[PDB]
Amino acid sequence: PFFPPLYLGGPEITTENCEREPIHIPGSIQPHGALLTADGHSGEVLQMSLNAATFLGQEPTVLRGQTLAALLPEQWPALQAALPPGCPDALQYRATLDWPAAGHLSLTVHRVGELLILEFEPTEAPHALRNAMFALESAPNLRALAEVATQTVRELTGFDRVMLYKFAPDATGEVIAEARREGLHAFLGHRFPASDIPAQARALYTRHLLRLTADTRAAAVPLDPVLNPQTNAPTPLGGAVLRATSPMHMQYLRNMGVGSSLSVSVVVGGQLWGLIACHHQTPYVLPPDLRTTLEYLGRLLSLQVQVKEALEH
Amino acid sequence: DPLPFFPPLYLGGPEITTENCEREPIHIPGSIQPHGALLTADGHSGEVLQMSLNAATFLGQEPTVLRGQTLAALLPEQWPALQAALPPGCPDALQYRATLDWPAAGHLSLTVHRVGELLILEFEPTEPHALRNAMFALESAPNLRALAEVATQTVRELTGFDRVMLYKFAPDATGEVIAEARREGLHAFLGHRFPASDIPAQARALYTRHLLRLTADTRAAAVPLDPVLNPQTNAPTPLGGAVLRATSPMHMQYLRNMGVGSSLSVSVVVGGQLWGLIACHHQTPYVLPPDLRTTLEYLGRLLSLQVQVKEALEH
Ligand SMILES: *C/C=C1/C(=C/c2[nH]c(/C=C3[NH+]=C(/C=C4\NC(=O)C(C=C)=C4C)C(C)=C\3CCC(=O)O)c(CCC(=O)O)c2C)NC(=O)[C@H]1C
Ligand SMILES: *C/C=C1/C(=C/c2[nH]c(/C=C3[NH+]=C(/C=C4\NC(=O)C(C=C)=C4C)C(C)=C\3CCC(=O)O)c(CCC(=O)O)c2C)NC(=O)[C@H]1C
Structure with missing residues (x-):
């Protein structure tokens, strides 16, 4: 099986238990980008990376209420069609946003069950x-x-x-x-x-x-909340390239x-x-x-x- | 029944009917489609040998001026890149592509491949x-x-x-x-x-x-190569690797x-x-x-x- 991750009080990793480290659910990302998770139906932003304010230029709370519909008007219907319910977690959709705060962002989205995982990078x-x-x-x-x-x-x-x-x-x-x-x-x-x-x-x-x-040598950036509201469980980040190493x-x-x-x-x-x-x-x-x-x-x-x-x- | 190729039309070969379908040497038609231009050049010296008849209008130069220069002089930035990318003995399937800014003709796409001792250069307008x-x-x-x-x-x-x-x-x-x-x-x-x-x-x-x-x-007429045969070999120029080749x-x-x-x-x-x-x-x-x-x-x-x-x- 796997050990629980650290942040759920699981054991720290050694060279005795190399095979059981849950590399897919670290609860954090690398700091050169930002990640949002969101509800598949409502487009409701459920989790964000504590650094999101930087990349997006948005007052922290603003985001964690808003909807993708609001937040990404042109994109949100494309996502809906590109990543239908039941698709594989391997399927990805990308777009380039000309976003006010940051010249151009790359956006990469995939779907894990009822959750959309959105990644933003310069x-x-x-x-x-x-x-x-x-x-x-x-x-x-x-x-x-x-x-x-x-x-x-x-x-x-x-x-x-x-x-x-x-x-x-x-x-x-x-x-x-x-x-x-x-x-x-x-x-x-x-x-x-x-x-x-x-x-x-x-x-x-x-x-x-x-x-x-x-x-x-860069420190990981936590997801907030760390657990997915939908499940009260860890967000699978296996298909995210921003996932912490x-x-x-x-x-x-x-x-x-x-x-x-x-x-x-x-x-x-x-x-x-x-x-x-x-x-x-x-x-x-x-x-x-x-x-x-x-x-x-x-x-x-x-x-x-x-x-x-x-x-x- | 599989049978060897007929000689092409320009070497006195027969015209193609429903009978002799499989024997048309489609790889050596001696001509290209008119939306681009083609040159052949000696693989070691870069001497320009053959050109499609429409080449002057793509490249904005007289034939005799083109044919009187080597690729070293015509393509000073690309000539060394070509030679590294397409070494002697390489397969005819290998292609090298570059974009040129040509004075008269805007942005041209250049596609090159090598057949024996011949370089084949295709030029097309690009966006x-x-x-x-x-x-x-x-x-x-x-x-x-x-x-x-x-x-x-x-x-x-x-x-x-x-x-x-x-x-x-x-x-x-x-x-x-x-x-x-x-x-x-x-x-x-x-x-x-x-x-x-x-x-x-x-x-x-x-x-x-x-x-x-x-x-x-x-419905477009094909544009002949000039001369039609490769002067290296007095034989047909192999065009099966050239997208411009006439159909x-x-x-x-x-x-x-x-x-x-x-x-x-x-x-x-x-x-x-x-x-x-x-x-x-x-x-x-x-x-x-x-x-x-x-x-x-x-x-x-x-x-x-x-x-x-x-x-x-x-x-
Ligand atoms: C206790 C377990 C250990 C361990 C864990 C581990 N390793 C990876 C991924 C990789 N490890 C690699 C090891 C090498 N890098 C090299 O340059 C060479 C040899 C020249 C080796 C053998 C490699 C290449 C990878 C792939 C990832 C990459 O290229 O960056 C993971 C998974 C990490 C993640 O998904 O974030 C884990 C948990 N590695 C060990 O050496 C032992 C001590
Ligand atoms: C005696 C000569 C005949 C002949 C020769 C021939 N055919 C090709 C190539 C192609 N023929 C194709 C036939 C079709 N087109 C369609 O739309 C369908 C079905 C929906 C079929 C069966 C196709 C598709 C090709 C490939 C080229 C292309 O995609 O257009 C060649 C070679 C051409 C060249 O290399 O320049 C030759 C010599 N075909 C016959 O039917 C008889 C009349």
Whole structure:
């Protein structure tokens, strides 16, 4: 099963109970964005991140009464149609708001049962993606495909280190390709145990395909209330990319000397084949539109891995 | 019966009838569609060899001036990028794309690929979260039918085409329309089937390697290359990788007879085989700009993946 989260007086996490940390319900988010939850029917704002006032420019109480209808007039019917009751928690809808306080915000919404989860992040506003797609497809074998993928991602993102991390049948991981800035250690060829990416995180990574830590020294921002009014239970944040990263996992990034980290799931035959895994030495908020490019690349790599593995077997 | 290609018309080959369908060398027509321009150049020196006859009007230069310069001089910023992206021996399927600001012609999209020692350069005029939203909707579709319907509707919304069909191949290479989105008033093609020589054998092979092709105006005359043969080889210039390549006159008559002014299609490739086609019709001529066509190319790949996934959920 899982332990209760901390804020419901559950046990603190060790290297003895790695598998039972409830990574999906931390009750908090990373501070480079803001999150609201809301009722599926009424559009009634039920929870907000204590930092919402910053991003939205709204007097705190104003929000926690109001309706999405009021708050987001153009958007609220689109949401209603895009995310019908009963849809999967994996389905997401995005829009760009030109919002008074903040030039442009990206809005990302998904639905978990009766709750809409809304994420707001700063945003903005060429051929590198098309060029990359063809490059991946003409790679002659899996090894070269891995090399092209890591190089392409590094060029698109500027990340200090991009790796392709492949899982063995026992969930033992191996860095099979790597693109990195001059003057970093080389993780190429190294294997790491299966507990370094524990079972409950690999399951989540099979369904929700992109996650990040923007700053491995930043404090999480609580949800208020912490419990969902609807249920008097924890809000599932598994499908939110603003969800706080497990402190057990940020301690392992800090000990490695990484200040920023992103990964994309490569999913083949319904299973987690491997990860595009990115490091930055310093804090780094990759903007939403560039993340989208990596999300596309994730799908394309999933296709090409199968194609390429089929021409060996 | 499968038989080798006839020589093209310009090398004294025969004219194409319903008898010799499968033998038209559709990859070497010696000509392009008039909404863009094409140059060929030597892959090592960058000497310009062939150009479409309309090139002066896209590029704003006399032929003899174009042909008298190397790509190093014509494309000083792109020439080194081309050479890195398209190394000798690379496959003909690999494409490099850039946007140019050309004085006379505005923003041009440049698409380049390499066939042996030849570079092929295509120039076309070029111009929010719809793709991301579509990607997730496709993935959440519960079964093959719902996927097919979401895919057709999405493509129609992105493009404005009068008709978008998912056209699936059977094992005998007959095809059937299994989903479609269509303009009000058009008759349905849903569930109709069509014989295997409707898209014959030398076109299905080409459609497994080069995944997008189009006919922007089913009545437009093709524009010859000049000279027609590659001076490197005194042989035909391979154009199967060029979206500008003229369409078969037999295929253009087939669309005209259906009342179609513009046709486009994307290949859906599963396990190395052509599974189907995203097929679009418009009743009037219609040019879809290169950046919009890129969205369809990306959806072609997504759909190939999702078709595998939906079919595996099915035994
Ligand atoms: C007590 C459990 C431990 C643990 C937990 C844990 N790990 C993740 C996610 C990841 N761990 C990774 C480990 C590595 N990073 C590397 O660079 C290498 C090798 C070169 C390894 C082996 C990776 C890559 C991930 C994926 C996420 C990412 O890329 O940022 C989680 C889930 C965290 C979350 O969802 O927020 C958890 C709970 N990690 C351990 O090492 C042990 C001590
Ligand atoms: C003897 C010659 C024949 C012939 C040749 C031919 N056909 C193609 C390509 C296509 N034919 C298609 C036929 C259909 N269009 C539809 O709308 C339906 C059903 C609803 C069918 C069955 C299609 C869809 C294509 C693909 C191109 C496109 O999407 O428009 C070629 C190759 C063209 C080229 O590469 O330039 C050739 C040579 N087809 C015949 O029926 C006979 C007359």
